[PDB]
Enzyme design. Structure first.
Site, PDB file in Angstrom:
ATOM      1  N   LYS A   1      -5.503   4.925   9.966  1.00  0.00           N
ATOM      2  CA  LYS A   1      -4.566   5.777   9.271  1.00  0.00           C
ATOM      3  C   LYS A   1      -4.909   7.234   9.520  1.00  0.00           C
ATOM      4  O   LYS A   1      -4.022   8.057   9.776  1.00  0.00           O
ATOM      5  CB  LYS A   1      -4.568   5.409   7.798  1.00  0.00           C
ATOM      6  CG  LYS A   1      -4.231   3.949   7.565  1.00  0.00           C
ATOM      7  CD  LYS A   1      -4.241   3.631   6.117  1.00  0.00           C
ATOM      8  CE  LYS A   1      -3.874   2.200   5.898  1.00  0.00           C
ATOM      9  NZ  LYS A   1      -3.782   1.893   4.455  1.00  0.00           N
TER      10      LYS A   1
ATOM     11  N   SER B   1       0.777  -1.232   0.000  1.00  0.00           N
ATOM     12  CA  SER B   1       0.000   0.000   0.000  1.00  0.00           C
ATOM     13  C   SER B   1       0.812   1.288   0.000  1.00  0.00           C
ATOM     14  O   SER B   1       0.350   2.316  -0.482  1.00  0.00           O
ATOM     15  CB  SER B   1      -0.892   0.011   1.232  1.00  0.00           C
ATOM     16  OG  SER B   1      -1.610  -1.202   1.326  1.00  0.00           O
TER      17      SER B   1
END
EC number: 3.4.21.53
Lengths: 150, 189
Positions: free
Chosen positions: B139, B96
């Site tokens: 996140k 990612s």
């Protein structure tokens, strides 16, 4: 299966709107749906329109149904560092390849540059220019080579 | 974050994290002024091979983007470059962060820093095709305490970002993208 669940949620939130909600009858509609399931998961239909140089849709029979992998490759280095110096521009295949794909891709490259001179001798772009190549992982080990046509 | 260093998000198995990423030249540029030789990468960061390939494919895409972009510059084709990926991502979320590397090398090319305190994540494919990523929540809360200004996210993921609790999103600018060239159109006005 997943649609099974994604229905159950609908019926369930629909129950919640009965036992305490105001309308006595749910009449679901594509527009009404947000209230019951929220915003969309899948929006891009295919991954994208083909990039003209280096992709071809590739069907593959992964463990859970078929899938249209793309395959992406690129020139790996400037082409005319040496108009005269003579070294092959090898592939680098990637993508957690199985060994049969190793053999398959090696055959494909060699036949490829064999074709290029077989039909377009004046061209040399593939025989003497570098190449990175990337078969996506996902294919069943047996069907891996079946991507080779693409 | 001076040139060739950038913060990076990671969805650790316990909460998020903002591990940095670093890159550097690894050999003298002029051992042979005419020498035609690869600017080979040497990645590090306790990478599994599943990453070690991915860094390389990203490497090739970076070198492609650049050569497509700035013909005079020849930096990236010819000079060794060591690269570090600090531990901390949960492995399923590891790839990612590929784009940050893709941006790191570019910063190392121009020698011009990114827009500041600009966290960014998301998987990429070999023509800059940003792909949707999970875990936006952790996140976000990690970035909220990290001074982030302008997150950039997969264009396919905005809804999920909009499913988060309200107070969390206050502050930070956001951007949605599909082609990496957009990000390159953000960092360098």
């Amino acid at each position: 299966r997943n649609l099974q669940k994604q229905v159950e949620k609908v019926l369930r939130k629909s129950a919640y709107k009965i036992v305490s909600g105001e309308a006595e009858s749910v009449e679901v509609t594509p527009e009404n749906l947000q209230d019951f399931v929220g915003k969309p998961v899948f929006t891009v239909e295919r991954m994208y329109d083909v990039t003209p140089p280096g992709v071809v849709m590739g069907l593959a029979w992964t463990a859970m149904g078929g899938s249209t992998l793309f395959v992406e490759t690129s020139l790996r280095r400037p082409q005319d560092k040496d108009a005269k110096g003579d070294k092959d521009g090898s592939l680098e295949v990637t993508g957690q390849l199985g060994e049969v794909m190793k053999e398959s891709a090696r055959i494909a490259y060699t036949f490829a540059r064999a074709f290029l001179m077989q039909h377009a001798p004046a061209n040399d772009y593939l025989v003497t220019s570098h190449i990175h190549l990337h078969v996506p992982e996902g294919a069943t080990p047996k069907d891996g080579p079946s991507a080779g046509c693409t | 974050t001076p040139p060739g260093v950038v913060m990076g998000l990671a969805w650790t198995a316990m909460g998020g994290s903002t591990l940095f990423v670093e890159t550097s030249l690894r050999r003298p540029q002029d051992k042979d002024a005419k020498g035609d030789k690869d600017g080979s990468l040497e990645v590090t960061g306790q990478l599994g091979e599943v990453m070690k390939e991915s860094a390389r494919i990203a490497y090739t895409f970076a070198r492609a983007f650049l050569m497509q972009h700035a013909p005079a510059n020849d930096y990236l084709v010819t000079s060794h470059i060591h690269l570090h990926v600090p531990e901390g991502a949960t492995p399923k979320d590891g790839p990612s962060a590929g784009c940050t590397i893709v941006t790191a090398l570019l910063s190392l090319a121009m020698g011009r820093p990114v827009r500041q305190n600009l966290a960014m994540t998301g998987e990429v494919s070999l023509t800059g095709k940003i792909l949707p990523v999970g875990g936006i929540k952790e996140k976000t809360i990690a970035a909220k305490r990290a001074g982030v200004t302008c997150i950039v996210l997969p264009a396919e993921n905005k809804k999920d970002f909009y499913d988060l609790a309200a107070f969390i999103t206050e502050g930070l600018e956001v951007h949605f993208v599909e082609h990496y060239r957009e990000i390159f159109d953000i960092a360098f006005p």
